[PDB]
Design an enzyme around this catalytic site. Structure first.
Site, PDB file in Angstrom:
ATOM      1  N   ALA A  95       0.842  -1.188   0.000  1.00  0.00           N
ATOM      2  CA  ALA A  95       0.000   0.000   0.000  1.00  0.00           C
ATOM      3  C   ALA A  95       0.885   1.249   0.000  1.00  0.00           C
ATOM      4  CB  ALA A  95      -0.914  -0.016   1.206  1.00  0.00           C
ATOM      5  N   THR A 146       3.903  -3.526  15.725  1.00  0.00           N
ATOM      6  CA  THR A 146       4.828  -2.395  15.654  1.00  0.00           C
ATOM      7  C   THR A 146       4.167  -1.156  15.057  1.00  0.00           C
ATOM      8  OG1 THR A 146       5.755  -2.789  13.440  1.00  0.00           O
ATOM      9  CG2 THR A 146       6.672  -4.067  15.257  1.00  0.00           C
ATOM     10  N   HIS A 175       4.950   0.194  12.397  1.00  0.00           N
ATOM     11  CA  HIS A 175       5.075   0.132  10.940  1.00  0.00           C
ATOM     12  C   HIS A 175       3.749   0.571  10.336  1.00  0.00           C
ATOM     13  CE1 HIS A 175       5.184  -2.023   6.939  1.00  0.00           C
ATOM     14  NE2 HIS A 175       6.362  -1.423   6.941  1.00  0.00           N
ATOM     15  N   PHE A 222      -9.417   8.257  -1.854  1.00  0.00           N
ATOM     16  CA  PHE A 222      -8.730   7.555  -0.772  1.00  0.00           C
ATOM     17  C   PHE A 222      -9.539   6.377  -0.263  1.00  0.00           C
ATOM     18  CE2 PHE A 222      -7.369   6.785   3.611  1.00  0.00           C
ATOM     19  CZ  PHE A 222      -5.995   6.693   3.438  1.00  0.00           C
ATOM     20  N   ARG A 277     -15.689  -3.271   6.369  1.00  0.00           N
ATOM     21  CA  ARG A 277     -15.720  -2.144   5.450  1.00  0.00           C
ATOM     22  C   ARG A 277     -15.492  -2.561   3.994  1.00  0.00           C
ATOM     23  NH1 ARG A 277     -14.587  -1.270  10.280  1.00  0.00           N
ATOM     24  NH2 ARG A 277     -15.024   0.672  11.393  1.00  0.00           N
TER      25      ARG A 277
END
Lengths: 154, 154, 154, 154, 154, 154
Positions: free
Chosen positions: F57, F87, F89, F114, F128
């Site tokens: 992504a 983490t 990240h 987006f 979603r």
């Protein structure tokens, strides 16, 4: 293998909205959503949109029944809110309304869109009347249009 | 974009009220409210108002069905109270009553006003029979009238 | 023994609404209710309805006083919301507003309808602005009309 | 259907501010807000603004009464703070002040703006004197102006 | 020592409003506030006000960017609501929106007013959309106007 | 007072979708939704739809940047999922992706949608990606189309 996917645009359509004025604080937004949906998205000419206010949500069936038997409309969008209270009155309104509306559609062959909120709190109703969970009004309007075409495609 | 908003005044109407005598202590106020509403507000001439006492609330459908099929009336207001007891008898009365009435309206095209209290306690019924939460009698009466016009407007 | 029951229909009337813009998110529905009430129910011709926005609810008296002393109007409906905060400011606003309005009516002989919400939470206000507990706007509007006639009947 | 929305700009106006010097540490900011509001926003020429210091907040009525009976001013903004103490003295000051002021406006027909803080703590007063919760001084000043026009519009 | 205090009145201005339709139940009041502010307060002629609906709040920048680069407008008011959900989606929308808008203003030299609610609950959004905490719509509108003048004054 | 409401139908458009293949189990439905939206709803001819798979992504920006700078497309829909791990990240991916994409749009003047899920759990992402909370894919696709028109309308 043949498939039917319909579109929500359907400009030559004449659509009826039945709204309950009880709880209009919420139902107003419910309408706005639907109307916009109809015109702006489904290309409906706004003199083919007719709006009928009935007092309670309980009345929605009878009202939409009339409109469907009239044959004047291609689909009816039914807008209302029913919030649960201290008694089981909530049960019978929302029940005789869900089933009333569903029946009308089944006999008249006219699509009826079930845009009736059935919540536990005023909070929840606000959530579905044009906030976090979208706008059941515009959503019911859309499912109405798509249905017109889905049917028309047979 | 055309709209239908109806009014509760409708003087040339003939309206029938069906009341259950069981629980009349409450139903009496339920009536008073309705009757007053009809005449004082909706301009109904009080010889066009006819009142039919049936024994239980369970009977309300059959009684109003007769009245609607008769064609003599423009709308029927259904008045009664069903308070929850120790058994699920409450369920089946209020159920076969909500659906019974709702059906009659749907077939006869006559508006039926669901002024039947469905409470948990005697306390709650009193609240809805002309106190804190208004008078479901007068309220059902009004929704009846408005409906007459709402329909008439198609 | 003679009795006075008045009606809410009164078409030849000229009515003034005073609204506070503070809290309009709620007061807007409060209005819609009242306006609709007036016209649709009370048969008021909507150029006899005049609407005056004052800033705070505290101002409602002075504003409606002017309107009543003017003699131009048959009654004034006062619309506003006052929600309780961290301080006792709530007390003096709602107080000086309830009494201000009540006084104006008493001196001017013009009916003033107290459609001012006085709640503890935003939640409660929403409940009374066109949901569970009806619409104090339309309710105040109605009690205004009825009053016109009640007075006229002496 | 006719409507009155007023504006806060009103330059040809002559306005009187009455402030209590007790608690001035807060009231000072209360003023600054108001004065700025008046001139910068409402276009008031600052020689039409007159400022009258009374000792306690309890005196605010008498003082503003004089000013309004004078007829020299189009509106009076009343600025002061009343913080709750150990006794119920708080009750009678803020009371006789809210009502005193409200009365003066009602008799004189002159707008009086209620910019009196009525808090539980010094903390809360600071919050409403030009921080988190805006500036009740400038807010009272604005509601004054708007009122001038709202009235003038009848 | 020279000072710049600007005024919110600025009639010869042409202003653009960008609103997100998502959450319109709140955004609607957000608008009303802004529009009213603009015209009634800032003296803006309402054919110089243009309103642009974009779908999500995330789009607000791109839309206002276009409007500012256009040069047709003296300022853009950006209206939307972003309520926090179960995921960090909330973070990136409100972020890319705050920064998007701020950037556009910085490059275009056109004022952009940040009237975007960024709350935790529907409750909080209602509080800032024309209740307890005023109306961020009207507030953003005002800060827009004042900015026009503040800039113009250099 | 002039207004811009756009429509989602825009058939003569050529649209690019960029998808991250990482997490494709979810991203697949994200696509299906978007594609369907585009063609069935926005009337897009499906040889004007081009789909570009990037690995992570994080790459979405660079990829859509190329596509927008190319000028071959009217809008880019960006699809991907980023679920939070042990983490931080998660933070830098979703961040450098939200901002990367937002930037591309702002410089290229091309709308970028987006449609990147940023959840805490696999559970939420499924919600979603075409269940309870609709399909951010189809939603992003729609907001893309509407944007095309919204811009075209200036």
């Amino acid at each position: 293998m043949n498939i039917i996917k319909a579109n929500v645009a359907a400009p030559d359509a004449r659509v009826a909205i039945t709204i309950a004025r009880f709880n209009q604080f919420i139902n107003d937004s419910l309408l706005d959503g639907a109307v916009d949906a109809l015109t702006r998205i489904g290309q409906v000419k706004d003199d083919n949109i007719t709006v009928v206010w009935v007092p309670g949500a309980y009345e929605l069936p009878l009202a939409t029944e009339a409109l469907a038997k009239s044959g004047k409309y291609d689909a009816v969008v039914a807008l209302g809110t029913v919030i649960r209270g201290g008694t089981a009155h909530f049960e019978y309104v929302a029940g005789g309304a869900s089933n009333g509306l569903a029946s009308v559609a089944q006999d008249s062959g006219v699509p009826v869109a079930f845009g009736v909120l059935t919540t536990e709190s005023i909070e929840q109703a606000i959530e579905r009347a044009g906030t976090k969970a979208g706008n059941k009004g515009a959503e019911a309007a859309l499912t109405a249009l798509e249905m017109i075409n889905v049917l028309k495609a047979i």
